[PDB]
Each structure stands twice: as structure tokens, then as C-alpha cells.
Design a binder for this molecule. Structure first.
Ligand SMILES: *[C@@H]1O[C@H](CO)[C@@H](O[C@@H]2O[C@H](CO)[C@@H](O)[C@H](O)[C@H]2NC(C)=O)[C@H](O)[C@H]1NC(C)=O
Ligand SMILES: *[C@@H]1O[C@H](CO)[C@@H](O[C@@H]2O[C@H](CO)[C@@H](O)[C@H](O)[C@H]2NC(C)=O)[C@H](O)[C@H]1NC(C)=O
Ligand SMILES: *[C@@H]1O[C@H](CO)[C@@H](O[C@@H]2O[C@H](CO)[C@@H](O)[C@H](O)[C@H]2NC(C)=O)[C@H](O)[C@H]1NC(C)=O
Ligand SMILES: *[C@@H]1O[C@H](CO)[C@@H](O[C@@H]2O[C@H](CO)[C@@H](O)[C@H](O)[C@H]2NC(C)=O)[C@H](O)[C@H]1NC(C)=O
Lengths: 41, 50, 37, 214, 228
């Protein structure tokens, strides 16, 4: 008798991407942008 | 730790994560370092100026 | 030692949006107030 | 507990043909079954460990098929290193219970035995006991019958037999039956006979002697 | 590699006790059930005892319960049987076996009884150690048929199971066939070894059976000749 609960998980896949990453006034990355993701970026 | 250079060493306020040893500026020069024996962070400032 | 307890009830594959997730440090370098690529 | 039954139980085959062994169970075991092989005089070794999976170093002619019950081991293209006794064991619940074995014999054109009867030696009759030996030499079907008769009375319960391993050259068997009497009881009868029945004999063969006739 | 050895067997008169020991090498001994498994002569395999780690769960057989006692020592990597008040149906070859794999940890190997010991022989007989009595079974016309005739040697009434009879100091290998020893009601063994030889050669050459009894020190050569 094995019961399973009601959690969840999520799976996504990686691609070769170029990222723009700003860190913070003390290390730790606050934000990054994905180019090739709209003509704006 | 094998990285050679010249300059002035001063006490720092930067605070490294445990997996970090060197710190780099925008010109990619090493400007901070963690001392491998006292585990304190130091700033490296060039010597010529003016 | 093995028991496969599965039920043959397939399942429509759902999807959801990872908006801005999954950003790691791709090095062991320290940096402050910058915009690295 | 959980009992196991192996169905073939003394299977006989030629060399280079298909062989099936079936093993059933008295509960629901999922895939926890192992097949073991014992050659005479050694320790048993595992061949299949989860009803379909060979071990490392087992040749690819053994095959396992399985279910809740009704497991099967198959040997295709038999080779002379594969003649042994095969057990099935269940790994599901403790205590782990064995099957019953299945000896696998080598085919051989029906061969009738040479029969020979030996009276007791004069040295033994001094000691006070009489062994009467009857020998059956070379023979495929081991399902031979040895009937002792003393003065034409079928003798029950004073004989012992043993049989040899299937011969590595001509794939035959040989059998020795010993009838044991006291000197006193030996000296009370005349004709000692040994009547052998066997598939290679159209009617049984009797070898006999007459106590006290040079 | 991985190995299991045993010791302690031999011969015991019934109503007395024995102790079998088994030593392992190459495992993590606390991650496996251990088992003792007997095999009677001329019969099949049959489990005797199972024990889990720390000795909490213990299975005996219905034929042996209340007389045998398992024990483990995970520090010394050792398995035991204390066999009390032995009987004549305990004459068997015993095996130490590992098949446990203990479903709470991350062990290695296969799931099954993959590794085995080598076997230890226990013989129960109020006997002692007696020497064989030998007779020659003469070649006779009742044994003769056409081109060949058979002659042999009957070696009977001995307890210490390993006994050997050769023909002509090991010369004749053709037709020489020693039959399995038989265990009488008296408790002593007996056997007879026979060889066929061309009927033209009844008495012509040498046919002397060399009887050697290794637990004792018996060595006797007996010649077999046609009946007087
Ligand atoms: C790095 O930045 C964080 C926030 O961006 C700083 O955390 C705050 O520090 C001020 C004063 O230093 C405190 O008054 C706040 O309460 C802090 N906020 C939190 C959420 O902790 C942090 O001090 C900075 N410096 C480091 C980590 O060395
Ligand atoms: C490296 O070795 C030095 C000594 O060779 C250690 O320095 C000691 O640090 C403690 C601080 O807990 C002081 O109380 C001692 O006086 C120091 N010794 C000397 C000789 O200065 C240092 O701790 C060592 N590195 C590590 C990580 O322990
Ligand atoms: C788990 O389910 C599978 C499939 O239902 C069983 O695995 C066998 O899988 C092979 C191919 O991988 C098939 O050809 C067999 O027919 C399957 N066996 C059966 C009996 O259908 C597997 O037996 C199941 N596991 C357990 C422990 O029952
Ligand atoms: C681990 O893998 C090696 C092969 O890399 C196996 O070694 C083979 O063992 C079989 C059985 O004796 C031999 O027929 C092969 O010749 C061996 N090959 C080599 C390269 O040694 C080994 O059996 C494997 N171990 C286990 C436990 O499966």
C-alpha cells in the first residue's frame, strides 16, 4: 500500500543562449536579459 | 595562490561567496582577493597615478 | 525488490511558463555594480 | 510458506536442441525468481536473477520468461557443459524456498545391458554371510528392473542397488544389485536367479546359478 | 574477490552437539541476511536457517526448530550454527549462503543467492571408524558373454566414508567402474568395483585390486581369478 501525496515538479530544457547579467552593489545577481527573445531585448 | 602582480593592498568591504577567490572589475583586472590564510578580503589598487 | 505500481491512465501533457527562471553563476568570479554578458 | 513446483523432473535430450523447464508458485511473486545450476559434487551457481536477466559471464543461450506465476527457463542449442541439475528459487518473501531440481540426461540409442550374476565367495561364507551380486553393464534407459528370485520366490527387501553416472564416452549406465543373506539362510535354497527387465530386451533376461555346483 | 568459508564439521555420535562457523570476506556484512542450507546425500537442496542483520528476525525449518541456534557477529563477520542433540538424518553437506541485500540500504551485487560457500560434511553415526573387509568376485561363465568377462572386488563393512579401490595400482582404466557405496542398516558402508576384460584373458594377466582406507591406514592387494 503506497500513497503518493500531491506535490509537483517542472522540467525545462537548456539551449545555447547569450545573457546580459547585472549583479548588485555587492555581488548577487539581480537581473539578466535574454537576447534573441524579441527585437527589443 | 600563483597570481602575481604589483600594487597596494588594503582592507575591503566586499564579501565573497564561499566558492569565490578573486574579484574582477569591468576591465577584467583583478581588483580584490581573498587571503588564503586569514580568509579576509583585500582590495588591490594600482601604484602609479597622476 | 521491484514492483511497478503504475496505472495505465496515460495523461495529457500540461505546460506552463517559466517567465525568468533558472539563472546560475556561470563562473566563480566575484563582481559588483556591472552588466556582464 | 510459498511452495514451488518444477514440472519436467528428469528430462532427457540430445546435444544441440531446445529444452524447456517450467516452475510454478503458490502465491503471487512479481519477478523475484532465480534459476540455479548444480553439477554433481559442486556448489550451485546463479544463472538468472530476476526471472529474465542473465548474470555476468553466462552464455546467451539461456532464456527466462516470467509472470506472477508460471516461470520458464529455456536452453536452445545445448552444449555438453549444460548437463546438470537445475533449481528454481523464489526471492519474494523470507524464508526463500527451493524447487525440486531437474536432472538433464544425454540421449543414446536403446542399448540392452550385459547381465552377470556372481555367487558369494567361499571366504565370505566362512564369515557367516552371503552377498549375491548381479551386474547390469552399459545401458541407456536406466529405468531397469532387477528382480531377485530364490528358488523361484521373488525376493523383497534384502537387496540394494546403485547406478553409475552416465558414461562420458558411450552415454550408458551401469547398475549393481546386491542381495544379502545369512550363511544359514543361504544354505537353505538352491537356485539363485537375477531377472533383468529393460526396454532393449524383448523379454526379461535371467542369469542364475545353483549353489554348490562348480 | 568475495568469499565465504566454513569450518567445524566432521563426525558426531547422535545425542551430542556440534558448532559450525562461517567467515566472510569482501562484503559489508551488516547489509545482508545470511543463511545455512543443507544437502542430504542423493537428494536436493533444502534451506535450514535464515537470519537478518542484528539477529532480530530468525527463521528455522520445521524439521530442525528447537534444536539448532543461529548467531551472527557483524564485527567479526561471522555466522554460526549451534547444533544440539543430533540425529541420523542430519548427515549432510552444509553451505553458508548470502542472499540478503536488506531492503533499507544501498547494497551491491545481485538480488538472490549469488555467492556460496564450499560445503562442510556432517556425519552422524554411532559407528566409530572400522576397516573394510575385502573379497574377490571371480570372473565366471555366468558373468562371461562372448568376447568379454567381468571380475571385481567387494569391499564392505566400513564406517569412514572415503575409501578407494584401484585396479593393478592404477593400471587398468578400461571397464573399471566403482559403484556408489551403500549404507546398510548396521550403519556401515559397503561397495563393489568391477571391471570387464576379454574372456580369452580370464587368468592370463594381473588383476589385483588395491584397497586403501585413508581415515584408517589399511592397504591390501587382492587378486581375482576364475572360480575353481
Ligand atoms: C548587500 O545588499 C543588501 C541589500 O541589497 C544589504 O542588506 C541591507 O543592508 C542594510 C544596511 O547595510 C540594512 O539596513 C538592511 O536591513 C539590509 N537588508 C536585508 C534584506 O538584509 C547588505 O547589507 C549588503 N551588503 C553585504 C551583504 O555585505
Ligand atoms: C594557518 O596557520 C596559522 C599559523 O601558522 C594559523 O594562525 C592562527 O590563527 C589563530 C586564530 O584562530 C590564532 O589564535 C593563532 O595565533 C594563529 N597562529 C599564528 C602563528 O599566527 C591559522 O589559523 C592557520 N589556518 C587555519 C585555516 O587555521
Ligand atoms: C513491469 O511492467 C513491465 C511491462 O508491463 C514488465 O516487463 C516486461 O517487459 C518486456 C519488455 O521490456 C516485455 O517484453 C515483457 O512482456 C514484460 N513482462 C510481462 C510479464 O509482461 C515487468 O514484468 C513488470 N515488472 C514487474 C516487477 O512485474
Ligand atoms: C565488470 O566488467 C568487466 C569487463 O570490463 C567484466 O569482466 C569480464 O568478465 C567475464 C566473466 O569472467 C569475462 O568473460 C570477460 O573476459 C571479462 N572482461 C574483462 C575485460 O575483464 C566483469 O565481469 C564485470 N563485473 C561484474 C561483477 O559484472
Amino acid at each position: 500500500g503506497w500513497t503518493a501525496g500531491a506535490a509537483a515538479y517542472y522540467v525545462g530544457y537548456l539551449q545555447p543562449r547569450t545573457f546580459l547579467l547585472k549583479y548588485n552593489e555587492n555581488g548577487t545577481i539581480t537581473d539578466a536579459v535574454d537576447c534573441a527573445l524579441d527585437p527589443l531585448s | 595562490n600563483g597570481l602575481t602582480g604589483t600594487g597596494v593592498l588594503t582592507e575591503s568591504n566586499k564579501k565573497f561567496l564561499p566558492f569565490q577567490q578573486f574579484g574582477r572589475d569591468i576591465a577584467d583586472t583583478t581588483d580584490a582577493v581573498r587571503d588564503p590564510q586569514t580568509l579576509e578580503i583585500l582590495d588591490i589598487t594600482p601604484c602609479s597615478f597622476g | 525488490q521491484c514492483v511497478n505500481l503504475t496505472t495505465r491512465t496515460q495523461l495529457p501533457p500540461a505546460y506552463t511558463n517559466s517567465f525568468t527562471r533558472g539563472v546560475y553563476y556561470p563562473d566563480k568570479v566575484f563582481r559588483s555594480s556591472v552588466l556582464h554578458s | 510458506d510459498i511452495v514451488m513446483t518444477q514440472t519436467p523432473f528428469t528430462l532427457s535430450a540430445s546435444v544441440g536442441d531446445r529444452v524447456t523447464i517450467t516452475c510454478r508458485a503458490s502465491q503471487g511473486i512479481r519477478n523475484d525468481l532465480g534459476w540455479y545450476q548444480q553439477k554433481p559434487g559442486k556448489a550451485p551457481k546463479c544463472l538468472i536473477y530476476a526471472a529474465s536477466s542473465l548474470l555476468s559471464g553466462v552464455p546467451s543461450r539461456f532464456s527466462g520468461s516470467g509472470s506472477g506465476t508460471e516461470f520458464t527457463l529455456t536452453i536452445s542449442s545445448l552444449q555438453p557443459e549444460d548437463f546438470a541439475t537445475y533449481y528454481c528459487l523464489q526471492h519474494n518473501s523470507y524464508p526463500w524456498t527451493f524447487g525440486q531440481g531437474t536432472k538433464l540426461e544425454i540421449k543414446r540409442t536403446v542399448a540392452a545391458p550385459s547381465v552377470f550374476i556372481f555367487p558369494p565367495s567361499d571366504e565370505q561364507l566362512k564369515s557367516g554371510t552371503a552377498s549375491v551380486v548381479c551386474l547390469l553393464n552399459n545401458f541407456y534407459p536406466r529405468e531397469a528392473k532387477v528382480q531377485w528370485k530364490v528358488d523361484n520366490a521373488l525376493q523383497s527387501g534384502n537387496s540394494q542397488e546403485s547406478v553409475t553416472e552416465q558414461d562420458s564416452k558411450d552415454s550408458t549406465y551401469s547398475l549393481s544389485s546386491t542381495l544379502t543373506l545369512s550363511k544359514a539362510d543361504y544354505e537353505k535354497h538352491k537356485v539363485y536367479a537375477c531377472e533383468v527387465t529393460h526396454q532393449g530386451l524383448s523379454s526379461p533376461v535371467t542369469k542364475s546359478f545353483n549353489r554348490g555346483e562348480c | 574477490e568475495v568469499q565465504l568459508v566454513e569450518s567445524g564439521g566432521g563426525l558426531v555420535k547422535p545425542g551430542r552437539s556440534l558448532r559450525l562457523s562461517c567467515a566472510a570476506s569482501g562484503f559489508t556484512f551488516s547489509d545482508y541476511y545470511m543463511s545455512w542450507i543443507r544437502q542430504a546425500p542423493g537428494k536436493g537442496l533444502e534451506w535450514v536457517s535464515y537470519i537478518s542483520s542484528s539477529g532480530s528476525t530468525i527463521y528455522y525449518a520445521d524439521s530442525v526448530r528447537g534444536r539448532f541456534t543461529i548467531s551472527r557477529d557483524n564485527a567479526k563477520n561471522s555466522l554460526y550454527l549451534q547444533m544440539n542433540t543430533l540425529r541420523a538424518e542430519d548427515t549432510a553437506v552444509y553451505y553458508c549462503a548470502r542472499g540478503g541485500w536488506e531492503l533499507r540500504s544501498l547494497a551491491g551485487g545481485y538480488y538472490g543467492m549469488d555467492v556460496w560457500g564450499q560445503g562442510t560434511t556432517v556425519t552422524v553415526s554411532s559407528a566409530s571408524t572400522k576397516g573394510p573387509s575385502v573379497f574377490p568376485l571371480a570372473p565366471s561363465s555366468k558373468s562371461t558373454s562372448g568376447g568379454t568377462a567381468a571380475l571385481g572386488c567387494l569391499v564392505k563393512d566400513y564406517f569412514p566414508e572415503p575409501v578407494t579401490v584401484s585396479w593393478n595400482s592404477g593400471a587398468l582404466t578400461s571397464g573399471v567402474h566403482t559403484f556408489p557405496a551403500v549404507l546398510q542398516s548396521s550403519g556401515l558402508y559397503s561397495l563393489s568395483s568391477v571391471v570387464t576384460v576379454p574372456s580369452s584373458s580370464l587368468g592370463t594377466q594381473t588383476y589385483i585390486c588395491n584397497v586403501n582406507h585413508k581415515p584408517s591406514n589399511t592397504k591390501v592387494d587382492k587378486k581375482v581369478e576364475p572360480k575353481s
